[PDB]
Write a protein that holds these residues in place. Structure first.
Motif, PDB file in Angstrom:
ATOM      1  N   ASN A  81       0.835  -1.188   0.000  1.00  0.00           N
ATOM      2  CA  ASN A  81       0.000   0.000   0.000  1.00  0.00           C
ATOM      3  C   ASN A  81       0.882   1.255   0.000  1.00  0.00           C
ATOM      4  O   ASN A  81       1.901   1.327   0.673  1.00  0.00           O
ATOM      5  N   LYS A  83       0.072   4.261   0.657  1.00  0.00           N
ATOM      6  CA  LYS A  83      -0.531   5.070   1.716  1.00  0.00           C
ATOM      7  C   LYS A  83      -0.284   4.529   3.205  1.00  0.00           C
ATOM      8  O   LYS A  83      -0.577   5.201   4.230  1.00  0.00           O
ATOM      9  N   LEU A  84       0.220   3.272   3.363  1.00  0.00           N
ATOM     10  CA  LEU A  84       0.463   2.669   4.691  1.00  0.00           C
ATOM     11  C   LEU A  84       1.952   2.503   4.853  1.00  0.00           C
ATOM     12  O   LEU A  84       2.522   2.463   5.941  1.00  0.00           O
ATOM     13  N   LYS A  85       2.593   2.441   3.714  1.00  0.00           N
ATOM     14  CA  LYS A  85       4.005   2.210   3.721  1.00  0.00           C
ATOM     15  C   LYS A  85       4.822   3.264   4.428  1.00  0.00           C
ATOM     16  O   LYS A  85       5.709   2.928   5.190  1.00  0.00           O
ATOM     17  N   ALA A 112      -6.154   1.801   5.534  1.00  0.00           N
ATOM     18  CA  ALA A 112      -5.667   2.897   4.695  1.00  0.00           C
ATOM     19  C   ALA A 112      -6.640   4.087   4.571  1.00  0.00           C
ATOM     20  O   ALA A 112      -6.260   5.150   4.148  1.00  0.00           O
ATOM     21  N   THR A 115      -7.173   8.562   6.599  1.00  0.00           N
ATOM     22  CA  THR A 115      -6.368   9.518   5.918  1.00  0.00           C
ATOM     23  C   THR A 115      -5.654  10.488   6.811  1.00  0.00           C
ATOM     24  O   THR A 115      -4.482  10.806   6.601  1.00  0.00           O
ATOM     25  N   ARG A 119      -1.801  10.482   8.894  1.00  0.00           N
ATOM     26  CA  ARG A 119      -0.879  11.568   8.679  1.00  0.00           C
ATOM     27  C   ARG A 119      -0.273  12.011  10.012  1.00  0.00           C
ATOM     28  O   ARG A 119       0.939  12.188  10.180  1.00  0.00           O
ATOM     29  N   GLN A 122       2.065   9.732  11.109  1.00  0.00           N
ATOM     30  CA  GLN A 122       3.316   9.883  10.403  1.00  0.00           C
ATOM     31  C   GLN A 122       4.187  11.002  10.907  1.00  0.00           C
ATOM     32  O   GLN A 122       5.422  10.993  10.811  1.00  0.00           O
TER      33      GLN A 122
END
Length: 164
Positions: A81, A83-85, A112, A115, A119, A122
């Protein structure tokens, strides 16, 4: 501590072909046998899976293999993915177990689509992300589990699993 234990507590370890919320034959720590309404196929899948004539029953040491397997599959799906990586990749060892526990519970896809929270994770806004997750539907479904996982994100420790 470990993922297994973790999942062990969150999920539950069943040693007998059981029915999913969805009604799909499952076993171990949420190991899916089949989508086929046929018990006689779960069986087959199982044995096929186990390498023996189970009889619809396995043994912990067995549930754990299934497990470790199911696990590295998740992980690869996580890395696939795009977006998950980045998140997973940025996370520390304990926060990763928290991501995984989630993917497991909701699949690489449902996960995923967080959103925002993703973030924040992250970015390192532990309290924010968490506050965030605290709002989800997810969290409203499976609270105790959600609490533990959010907490673990926030704190970044097993504390949440230590005195159950």
């Amino acid at each position: 501590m470990n993922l297994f234990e973790m999942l062990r507590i969150d999920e539950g370890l069943r040693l007998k072909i059981y029915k999913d919320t969805e009604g799909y034959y499952t076993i171990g720590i949420g190991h899916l046998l089949t989508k086929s309404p046929d018990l006689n196929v779960a069986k087959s899948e199982l044995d096929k899976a186990i390498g023996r004539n189970c009889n619809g029953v396995i043994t912990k040491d067995e549930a754990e293999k299934l497990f470790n397997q199911d696990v590295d599959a998740a992980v690869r799906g996580i890395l696939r993915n795009p977006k998950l990586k980045p998140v997973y990749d940025s996370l520390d060892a304990v926060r990763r177990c928290a991501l995984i526990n989630m993917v497991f519970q909701m699949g690489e896809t449902g996960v995923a689509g967080f959103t925002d929270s993703l973030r924040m994770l992250q970015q390192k806004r532990w309290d924010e992300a968490a506050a965030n997750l605290a709002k989800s539907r997810w969290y409203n479904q499976t609270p105790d589990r959600a609490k533990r996982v959010i907490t673990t994100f926030r704190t970044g420790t097993w504390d949440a699993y230590k005195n159950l």
